[PDB]
């Protein structure tokens, strides 16, 4: 049942833990926070050319966070890969140190301060997103493996919440080739290779098999097959990982107590839509897109949802509708009652979002938190 005394559950559409031997419950929400950069190549969150590495961890439990979804690649997680970039000087007890032990030392001190981990398996090798969750020279058995021995190794630290088994998958072509030509993630096209529904039932219960008190984390696709994209006006246009569209109708066959469905949703820092125009409704049509592509997986199906990554520059050099997108985003969550998320990022340096850190890497963005705090009160 669990190495640590202590399990994760889903019940409805909120998140439990249970201490094991107490018998006690708690629901929890997550406040989190994406930093990135183990899944670079890096090999390490970023900011430790400026920052203290423990420092950073108290700045985001001084904001309020209470959750840090940390996105890896495969060679993060291998004993013997050499962080890059960091400033010793003020890091000096990460001298030494390989990736795999800075990630064992960061979230074994956010359990300390009581901060949940969810663990992102975000690139299989350093440079970009794959759309699949293999390529030429990595198998989905690789992958597997690797997830494998991460639940392995993580599964015995505490506040480790579960695995998010993949990030974004999505298609690198137009429909109608993005359905068949095979380089692409699909979703009840029916073929398991390029099925993210079915790959993450394989990966999930792989997963639960060595971690059974873990969560798993299942984002969407882009596009999923074409009967379900032609049945709504934006079908097209979700994001990478945003596309929950077919969860009604192809659920994913995993145990219900275990599984969080997890869009990421963006506004129009990172892309223009033709929705973000006040000429297509912009704002007030924002709701309705959001309900279609993830929000009704929780207010219709009932099943637990987190926001794996939404945010933008809240206009800091950017669009600035963005304000008005996060604005109208946060006041649509808290309505709602989807209380758990990560936003991108802790992180200033994401090119389309900037993150809560200005590019001193030490002061936040004052206004842009100010939004977010209304989700955590």
């Known amino acids: 049942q669990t ?8 019940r409805g559409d ?24 183990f899944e670079t190549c890096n090999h390490v969150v970023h900011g430790l050319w400026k920052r203290n590495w423990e420092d950073m961890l108290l700045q985001i ?12 690649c495969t060679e993060s997680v291998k004993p013997g890969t050499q962080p890059i970039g960091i400033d ?26 009581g901060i949940f981990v969810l663990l992102d398996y975000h690139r299989i ?13 990595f198998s989905e058995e690789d992958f597997i493996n690797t997830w494998i021995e991460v639940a392995k190794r993580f599964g015995k630290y505490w506040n480790v919440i579960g695995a998010d088994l993949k990030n974004e998958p999505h298609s690198v072509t137009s429909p109608p080739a ?53 049945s709504y006006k934006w079908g097209y246009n979700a994001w990478w990982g945003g596309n929950l569209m077919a969860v009604k109708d192809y659920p994913v066959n995993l145990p219900k107590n275990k599984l969080v469905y997890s869009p990421h949703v963006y506004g129009p820092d990172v892309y223009n839509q033709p929705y973000f125009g006040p000429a297509k409704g912009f704002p007030d049509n924002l709701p309705d897109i959001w309900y279609h592509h993830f929000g009704y997986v929780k207010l219709e199906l009932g099943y637990s949802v987190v926001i794996g990554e939404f945010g933008g520059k809240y206009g800091h050099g950017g669009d600035p509708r963005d304000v008005i997108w996060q604005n109208k985003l946060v006041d649509w969550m808290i309505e709602n009652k989807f209380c758990d998320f990560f936003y991108w990022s802790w992180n200033p340096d994401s090119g389309d979002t900037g993150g809560i850190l200005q590019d001193d890497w030490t002061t936040i963005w004052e206004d842009k938190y100010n939004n977010l705090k209304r989700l955590m009160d």
């Open 3 to 10: 190495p640590t005394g202590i399990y994760y559950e889903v």
């Open 14 to 37: 909120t998140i439990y833990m249970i201490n094991v031997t107490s018998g006690e419950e708690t629901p929890i929400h997550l406040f989190g926070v994406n930093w990135f950069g």
């Open 61 to 72: 439990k001084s904001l309020g966070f209470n959750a840090i979804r940390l996105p890896f």
């Open 88 to 113: 010793y000087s003020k890091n000096p007890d990460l001298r030494g140190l390989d990736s795999l032990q800075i990630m064992e030392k960061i979230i074994k001190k956010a359990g300390d301060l």
């Open 125 to 137: 090798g350093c440079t970009h997103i794959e759309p699949l969750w293999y390529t030429e020279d």
């Open 178 to 230: 993005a359905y068949t030509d095979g380089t692409g993630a699909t979703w009840g096209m029916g073929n398991p290779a390029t099925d993210w529904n079915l790959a993450a039932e394989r990966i999930g219960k792989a997963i639960l098999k060595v971690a059974p008190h873990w969560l798993i984390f299942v984002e969407g696709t882009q596009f999923t097959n074409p009967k379900t994209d032609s």
